[PDB]
Amino acid sequence: MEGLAGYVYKAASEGKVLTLAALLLNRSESDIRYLLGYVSQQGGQRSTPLIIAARNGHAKVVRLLLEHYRVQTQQTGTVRFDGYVIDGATALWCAAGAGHFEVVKLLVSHGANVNHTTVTNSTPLRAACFDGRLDIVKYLVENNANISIANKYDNTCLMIAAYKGHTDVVRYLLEQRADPNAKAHCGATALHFAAEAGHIDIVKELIKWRAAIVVNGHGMTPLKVAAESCKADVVELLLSHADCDRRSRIEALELLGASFANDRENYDIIKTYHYLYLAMLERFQDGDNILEKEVLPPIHAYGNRTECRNPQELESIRQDRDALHMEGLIVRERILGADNIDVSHPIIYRGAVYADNMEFEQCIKLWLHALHLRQKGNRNTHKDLLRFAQVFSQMIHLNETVKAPDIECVLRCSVLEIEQSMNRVKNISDADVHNAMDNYECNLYTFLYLVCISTKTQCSEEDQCKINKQIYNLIHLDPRTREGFTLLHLAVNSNTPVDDFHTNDVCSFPNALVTKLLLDCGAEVNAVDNEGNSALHIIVQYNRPISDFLTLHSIIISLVEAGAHTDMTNKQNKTPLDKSTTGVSEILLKTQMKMSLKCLAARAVRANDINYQDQIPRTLEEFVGFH
Amino acid sequence: KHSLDLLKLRHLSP
């Protein structure tokens, strides 16, 4: 009788009071429990009829279910599908998340669990704070709700309310004996989220309640996070707390000026110089000498600038915008170090701007510094190499001689990142195995784009030797995609994706130059994927044998003359002349095919099923296994 | 262009 359960779920989800009354009419107690407790799936979520009735805000349906039928408010289901697959959520949690005060009042009063604990210890009060409705939070808290109960990561009810722009619920919680000194898994308190979001009222009400400013796990006080999030008005109120001393104020002002200098949304120059000069003034106005700062050595990425340690050194860079960007990057680096999460993103954005306004050399310097910083922190540099491929392709399309040491460094960090990605794939079992494999394939494609760009540049002998050394290292690393394609199958396959940006205009696979460069670096020419197709079974399938015949000819003579087997048979029992589908490719392969007694004897051995195990030399067992 | 391409939820569960 699952049909009645499905119709009842539909009637409860869509608020059909009369239809649900007609459906549950003429039913027995066991039937009533079966229909009103059954778990139904209607896209992404497991939910009972009452869970989906309260989650859709159908007050009449929920009140009808609890008045006559002895339904229980402790059922288990799933509610959301925006990165939030949470089990064990009762009807209170669904009602609070959907923000329906009219159902939660009719649900609690009928014997409900106000402080239910789901799988990730999320109280229904947490959902009501997430929505921000004061009426639901107040009703729950008045009905014996715990405020200090948090999830496994210690994200209390107050912190999620402080993260969002809800003011009334935050003020009410701080008025209801809440704890303003919660410590999350990363050390973040309530002030960090409220400051980074940009809510002045939440921060003011917290510092009114003795918020007890403490540095988070990643060496960042709330002032530093507020300044890093480019929130000026948030930072300029914690200085009145009288416990901030002076160095914290100075570093907050300097970080705020830095973040204003190099940001996308709120990009300021008058405000940047105003705050930087305020910080330097408060540094150098003490009178008993100064309040000096330790400064990193001149970083080659930002020219040769040792930031600014002189009153006539900031007054003389008010009128320059590149100098302000460089100084902001330098102070943000010396404040945040290099291992912080959000220290490299302004560098990446400034590099993107410099690429946009045709400053390709400074773009390259800044973006190599960004990749070096991210490699020190071991973050996900899979998009960064793609952006390098796009920038270099734009360089070649503009007939600009790209510097070869830069390409060597990019390739070295590409092979290091590919090794890191292989380690990550070997580590991440199943939680993000598809994401890891997608990142790995993207990294291999970016390395191939860099190789093709390298073939498009006339480098010297030493530079070409270094590029060959990096390609040699990655080839001997032997990467393999999810389809078993090595770096040679993709260099000859016409189906390898090319990024929609300028990389289409330069890196056009298949390339005879890329394949020749790989084969000069000891590429496994006889490499076999999991399907069976070799490096030669793939190229002969090329659908353009006349348009770029040279790019075909010089790629089907480079394979065969190096180490390829012309007659080797894949797992589908297909000679490369059989898997050709092109007269030109078939003839161009047949002209390179030298018949030999070994291939004929191996084919005659394999055809009639002769037991060739341990009766032939070990190097001929794989030979017979080919044909 | 280049700038027009650059455009934690586990800890932010409701």
Numbering used by the authors:
A (entry chain D): 1 to 627
B (entry chain G): -22 to -16, -7 to -1
Give the exact sentences the study uses for this entry:
Furthermore, we reveal distinct dimerization states of unmodified and neddylated CRL2FEM1B to uncover the NEDD8-mediated activation mechanism of CRL2FEM1B. Our research also indicates that, FEM1B utilizes a bipartite mechanism to recognize both the C-terminal proline and an upstream aromatic residue within the substrate.
Due to the limited resolution of C-degron peptides observed in all solved cryo-EM structures, we performed local refinement for the N8CRL2FEM1B dimerS1 to obtain a 3.55 Å resolution structure of the FEM1B-CCDC89 subcomplex. For convenience, the peptide is numbered from the C-terminus, with the last Pro being Pro-1, the penultimate Ser being Ser-2, etc. Most residues of CCDC89 are visible in the structure except for the five central residues (−12RELNG−8), probably due to their intrinsic flexibility. Pro-1 is accommodated by the same FEM1B pocket that has been reported to recognize the arginine at C-end. The main chain carbonyl group of Pro-1 is hydrogen bonded to the side chains of Ser122 and Arg126 of FEM1B, and its side chain forms hydrophobic interactions with Tyr84, Trp93, and Phe130. The N-terminal portion of the CCDC89 peptide, −22KHSLDLLSKE−13, adopts an α-helical conformation and interacts with TPR3, TPR4, and a 310 helix insertion in ANK8. Specifically, His-21 is positioned in a hydrophobic pocket composed of Val391, Phe501, and His502. Additionally, the imidazole ring and main chain nitrogen group of His-21 form hydrogen bonds with the side chains of Gln394 and Asp356, respectively.
